Every structure is written in structure tokens, then in C-alpha cells.
């Protein structure tokens, strides 16, 4: 009770999806979506420029910009996207490069229960790989309990002075079903993500992905938004979980998929508050 009523009321307001998703529905973009029914809104989708002139449709990826506030800088925003398909790996790196993203949050394993959630889009440690026009070196990997950090260096093949470091925070322990029973791992992880992002000036939006780009993706993003409000305005500031979910859902449909994820968000915030009060 209370959480179910709140989540069910949110699910009410999305029974009609109002904003247009026509680009994702185009015949040329059909096999760029992992799920037929999960598509980016046209008005917030990431439009990919500088594509191959021989490709009739080269501007599409299943991804949306998410701003936490109406006047949010790119540095304070997110990109919510699906895990790479075999044929969108190159488009994914075009997106990272174009948006100047410096931090990637991966919320899934590559494969879970025998189903691909994300095709591997990074080289092995110390290896280099070319993804279309983009070159990626994997400089170092650091294992933590819940995640692995991959320090990647991304550049455009041939062009000088385009190299930049992209930090891939790969959350590894999310359960195959349900949500973690305690938010500690996610909070410590998001704390490292945030400090990394804030330390890079002129960084672009943080890229966050899951299999569809809405469930785990929305859960991670909304928690990050809320704890950053607490970071900025203190532990007695007012927190409106439903309105925050409404805000991100106006930019990509269906963010935060299950009531367990909904309860997990509240738990994470309450833990973050408790952590600051309890030293």
C-alpha cells in the first residue's frame, strides 16, 4: 500500500503514450531496436550527425536525452539507451563521441539467462579495436565488489586531437530477476559515477543503458537525480519520487518498469539520507 497506489497511478498516466515516436518506427530503423514496442520520443531522441553518406538513414539510435531540470546543462543530463545490438555498436560510439559523454553506466551483464542484453562494445583489457570510424583502447580495468571500471580512450580514426577518456562503470551484480535487496552497492557505485563526472569539465551527458533502456536505466537515473538533490539541498529537502519519474518519462517512455524498482528507489534515497545522518 502507498507505494502500489503511487506506482499504479503513474502507470495510469502512461496507458496512452502521447509524444510521437515516428523515427523509431521507420522501416530503415526496424532492426536498430531491440524491442519493437520500446522507441525513443522524436523530440528528445539523440540525432546522429556526420553519418556515412551512402547510408540513406544514418541519424538514428534508440536513445533519448534525459534532463533532470528544464534548464539542465549537458553535464548534468543523461542519455538513456538500450544495450548495443550487433549492428548498432558503431552507432553507439558515434553517439558517445558526438555528445562528448565521458562516463558510461552499464546496468546489465552482456547475457542474462541466455538472452543478450548488450553486445560487447569495448575491447579486452590493454587491447584496441576500431568500431567504424571510432578507435577505442581499453587502458585498464579495476574490479570492485559490485562493478568493474574500464578506463577507455576513444578517438576518431585518423583525426588528430580527438582522443578523450571514457569511463565505463559496469554494474555486474544486479540480479537476473527482481532488484537488489539492499541499495548499498548501487549507492556506492553512483557515488563513484558522480564524482568522476563532476571532475571532468565540459563533460557531456552520462550514458546509462540496460536491455531496453527504460527499466534498470530509469531506476539508476532517478536514484542519481534524487540523491544529487539531497547532495545539493540537504537531507530535509522535499523529495517527490512520482514527479521525478514523471519528469524523466516525459523524455523517454516507460522509465522505471516495476513496482519492485519503485520501492528500490525509495529505499536507496532513505539509505542515502541515513548515511549522511549516521556519519
Amino acid at each position: 500500500s502507498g507505494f502500489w497506489e503511487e506506482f499504479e497511478t503513474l502507470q495510469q498516466q502512461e496507458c496512452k503514450l502521447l509524444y510521437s515516436r515516428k523515427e523509431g518506427q521507420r522501416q530503415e530503423n526496424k532492426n536498430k531496436n531491440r524491442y519493437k514496442n520500446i522507441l525513443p520520443f522524436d523530440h528528445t531522441r539523440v540525432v546522429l550527425h556526420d553519418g556515412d553518406p551512402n547510408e540513406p538513414v544514418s541519424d538514428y539510435i534508440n536513445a533519448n536525452i534525459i534532463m533532470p531540470e528544464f534548464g539542465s546543462s549537458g553535464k548534468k543530463s543523461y542519455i538513456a539507451t538500450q544495450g548495443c545490438l550487433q549492428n548498432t555498436v558503431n552507432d553507439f560510439w558515434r553517439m558517445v563521441f558526438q555528445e562528448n559523454s565521458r562516463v558510461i553506466v552499464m546496468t546489465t551483464k552482456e547475457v542474462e539467462r541466455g538472452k543478450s542484453k548488450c553486445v560487447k562494445y569495448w575491447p579486452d583489457e590493454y587491447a584496441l579495436k576500431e568500431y567504424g570510424v571510432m578507435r577505442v583502447r581499453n587502458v585498464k580495468e579495476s574490479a570492485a565488489h559490485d562493478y568493474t571500471l574500464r578506463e577507455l580512450k576513444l578517438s576518431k580514426v585518423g583525426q588528430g586531437n580527438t582522443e578523450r577518456t571514457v569511463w565505463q562503470y559496469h554494474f555486474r551484480t544486479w540480479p537476473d530477476h527482481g532488484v537488489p535487496s539492499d541499495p548499498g552497492g548501487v549507492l556506492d557505485f553512483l557515488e563513484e559515477v558522480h564524482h568522476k563526472q563532476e571532475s571532468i569539465m565540459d563533460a557531456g551527458p552520462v550514458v546509462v543503458h540496460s536491455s531496453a533502456g527504460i527499466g534498470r536505466t530509469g531506476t539508476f537515473i532517478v536514484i542519481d537525480i534524487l540523491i544529487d538533490i539531497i547532495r545539493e539541498k540537504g537531507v530535509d529537502c522535499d523529495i517527490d519520487v512520482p514527479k521525478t519519474i514523471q519528469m524523466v518519462r516525459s523524455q523517454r517512455s516507460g522509465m522505471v518498469q516495476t513496482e519492485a524498482q519503485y520501492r528500490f528507489i525509495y529505499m536507496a534515497v532513505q539509505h542515502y539520507i541515513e548515511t549522511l545522518q549516521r556519519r
Binding site: 519493437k36 514496442n37 520500446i38
Partner: peptide, 5 residues
């Protein structure tokens, strides 16, 4: 084809 979650 359809996102169950």
C-alpha cells in the same frame, strides 16, 4: 519482440 520485464 516485446519487453516483458
Amino acid at each position: 519482440s516485446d519487453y516483458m520485464n
